[PDB]
């Protein structure tokens, strides 16, 4: 729709200039003319340096090194308007008043910085492409060539590894621990190339990391569990989790009512279930609550004190 305007506003008519309408850049940040001062950096303006910071932070927190960000002024947008696209899709838009501050007190460049970083985090799994996967594999190869060679390209293609990494990022599991990830892939890759299963084994191998992500030191972790009924009903539907519409809505609300209780009490809502069901529970809840962490018992370290506050029925 806005591409229609871009084409019509600009001169895009010939075969050669129409290609530019095809936006394939992994990350695009677009702004109206009012946001030129922050974008340029010869008239001050922090954007480039701010993006560098983001790339460093997220590399250390996620294990993902974001690609080059494409930066374009866009006349279709309002003076103060910015827009963020990832892999061709708009994921965020906003407005900044450069001479102002947002009330704790935040300057505009910081507002856009944390907005960009949060959006990249929400879509990180869309950004671990082949290029980034190869960069990580090549980096791993410098210190672990025997391990890498055991994994790839046989039994596992770069593409297979990419899907495991994307599935980890999707659920906010950092991919910094490349050694453990690849040792798990080496151990299972000959038994299966199924990226769904490879990721269940990898998540388990990453129990220490996942427990640190959710559990506090020597403190009991507040966790909703799943009924024996809910657990049997999902297992039955495995063929690809197909369940009749009435069952799904029922599990969805049990989850919804239980989750409310945790966030009513300033707590992060987590869900525990048994390993063979975990991946399917997640698939089911994805559209209803994308960012409800669904854990399996084998992803929490043995030493962790876990207690139910609600039981999903």
d(CA 234, CA 294): 14
- Tokens 């043995």 found at: 302
Give the distance, in angstroms, between the CA of residue 96 and the centroid of all CA atoms in the same chain: 26
d(CA 264, CA 76): 42
Experimental technique used to determine this entry: X-ray
Give the closest residue to 269 by CA, choosing from 300, 217, 219, 308.
308
Q: What's this structure's resolution in Å? A: 2.3
**C-alpha angle 112-212-300 in degrees, rounded to nearest 5:** 130
Pairing of strands 306-312, 221-226: parallel
- The DSSP string of 75-124 is TTS-TTEEEEEETTEEEEEEE--TT--B---B-HHHHHHHHHHHHHHHTH
d(CA 147, CA 24): 34
> For residue 187, what are its two tokens?
């151990």
d(CA 120, CA 114): 10
For residues 71 and 50, the answer to whether their CB atoms sit within 8 Å is no
Long-range contacts of 150-154 (CB under 8 A, 24+ apart): 150/186, 151/182, 151/185, 151/186, 151/189
d(CA 304, CA 223): 12
For residues 141 and 70, the answer to whether their CB atoms sit within 8 Å is no
Residues 6 or more apart whose Cβ sits within 8 Å of residue 217? none
> For residue 34, what are its two tokens?
């009012």
For residues 179 and 213, the answer to whether their CB atoms sit within 8 Å is no
Pairing of strands 81-86, 271-273: unpaired
> Could you tell me the domains of the chain?
1-99+108-128 (3.40.30.60), 129-313 (no CATH)
d(CA 110, CA 97): 12
d(CA 50, CA 47): 5
Give the closest residue to 281 by CA, choosing from 254, 257, 310.
254
For residues 308 and 226, the answer to whether their CB atoms sit within 8 Å is no
d(CA 154, CA 158): 9
């Amino acid at each position: 729709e806005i591409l229609e305007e871009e084409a019509e506003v600009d001169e895009l008519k010939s075969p050669e200039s129409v290609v530019q309408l095809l936006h394939i850049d992994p990350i695009e940040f677009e702004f109206g003319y009012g946001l030129i001062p922050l974008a340029d950096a010869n008239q001050g303006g922090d954007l480039l340096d701010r993006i560098v910071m983001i790339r460093r932070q997220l590399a250390l927190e996620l294990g993902l090194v974001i690609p080059v960000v494409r930066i374009r002024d866009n006349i279709a947008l309002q003076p103060n308007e910015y827009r963020l696209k990832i892999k061709g899709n708009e994921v965020a838009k906003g407005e900044l008043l450069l001479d102002h501050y947002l009330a704790t007190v935040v300057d505009p460049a910081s507002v856009v910085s944390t907005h960009i970083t949060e959006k990249i985090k929400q879509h990180a799994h869309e950004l671990i492409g082949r290029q980034e996967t190869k960069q990580l594999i090549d980096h791993l190869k410098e210190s672990y060539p025997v391990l890498v060679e055991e994994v790839t390209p046989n039994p596992l293609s770069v593409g297979d590894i990419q899907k495991v990494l994307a599935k980890l990022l999707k659920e906010k599991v950092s991919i910094r621990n490349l050694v453990t990830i690849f040792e798990t892939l080496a151990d299972y890759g000959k038994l299966t190339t199924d990226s769904d299963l490879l990721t269940e084994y990898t998540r388990q191998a990453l129990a220490k990391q996942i427990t640190a992500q959710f559990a506090k030191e020597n403190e009991v972790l507040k966790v909703v569990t799943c009924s024996g009924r809910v657990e049997k009903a999902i297992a039955d539907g495995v063929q690809y989790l197909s369940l009749e519409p009435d069952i799904s809505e029922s599990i969805v609300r049990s989850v919804a009512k239980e989750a409310e209780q945790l966030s009513l009490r300033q707590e992060t809502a987590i869900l525990l279930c048994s390993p063979p069901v975990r991946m399917y529970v997640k698939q089911l809840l994805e559209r209803y609550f994308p960012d409800l962490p669904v854990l399996s018992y084998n992803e929490l370290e043995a030493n962790v004190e876990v207690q139910s506050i609600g039981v999903v029925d």
